[PDB]
């Protein structure tokens, strides 16, 4: 995730042992249960995508929910991509690059990128708009359930 450090930079650290055991015990008990929403917000406080997808990725199993949470997360990025539209071309100077939907997910961004924007002024918010979007996917497992 992104932390604040002492002279009050916006850095990046390592994803936790302890939330990532944390999330695997949740998923393990309760994956389709409304419980895992709330526990999946405490535990991404502040992570990037990278982070969000390394929680997801360590979801074994659950075969079903896990392309439920995938057509949503794809669902989002395909909107994304049309309520916030680019031109094409190469951006004018050596610094910038407009977030895509398959960058909010990480699949076409990478962690520098990721903090780049997390960290600009004004913020985009990638981690934060990709939490959103797992957490429309968690209600979907939880709301079809079984």
Avoid: C
């Amino acid at each position: 995730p992104i932390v604040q450090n002492l002279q009050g930079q916006m850095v990046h650290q390592a994803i936790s042992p302890r939330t990532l055991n944390a999330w695997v015990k949740v998923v393990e008990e309760k994956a389709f249960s409304p419980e895992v929403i709330p526990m999946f917000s405490a535990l991404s406080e502040g992570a990037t995508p990278q982070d969000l997808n390394t929680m997801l990725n360590t979801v074994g199993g659950h075969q079903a929910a896990m392309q439920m949470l995938k057509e949503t997360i794809n669902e989002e990025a395909a909107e994304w991509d049309r309520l916030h539209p680019v031109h094409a071309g190469p951006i004018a100077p050596g610094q910038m690059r407009e977030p895509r939907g398959s960058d909010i997910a990480g699949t076409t961004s990478t962690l520098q990128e990721q903090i780049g924007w997390m960290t600009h002024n004004p913020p985009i918010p990638v981690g934060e708009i990709y939490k959103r979007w797992i957490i429309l996917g968690l209600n979907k497992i939880v709301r079809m359930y079984s």
